[PDB]
Amino acid sequence: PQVTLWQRPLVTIKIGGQLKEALLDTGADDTVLEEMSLPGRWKPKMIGGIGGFIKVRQYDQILIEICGHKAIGTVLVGPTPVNIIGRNLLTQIGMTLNFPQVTLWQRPLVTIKIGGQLKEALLDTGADDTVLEEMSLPGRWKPKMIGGIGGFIKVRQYDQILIEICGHKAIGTVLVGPTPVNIIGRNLLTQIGATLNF
């Protein structure tokens, strides 16, 4: 199945005998699920993201069914605002990003040009918006807060910003702030015709 990114790429997953909805997240190295009941032992762990860090319980060798496709791997359970399926599992179900096909064994990084500057960014299907690390940008902006795994961060919102992503031009909103990594969200991914295929 092929999926466009005009909407959040949600899928049905079965794990620990329970059915849930989760977000296919190319920007996530791992899989993190909201609090739930899982059998066996786990290991304390801290993961980072926008907003900061959160403590999670690490379950290894867990069987998970993502839209019918079976996979076994590590699942983190903690105070995440959204269930997300990270690359550790996306690779198991043959997930690829197309916009130029890209597998997910490595972070899907791209070169972008914005504000006359060159940078590297992460193609993030789990992000609604595009968020870049502090940088010099022309024009006016408006205060705005966005949430993430570790909480929220204050960012500067710039509209109608021209950005080139691996040669492809797009114009849209770009948020600049305390993000741990530059991420290209769905607002821009749709413009470069990005699709998820598995």
Binding site: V82, D124, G126, D129, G147, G185
Partner: peptide
Amino acid sequence: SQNY
């Protein structure tokens, strides 16, 4: 908000 949000972005993951």
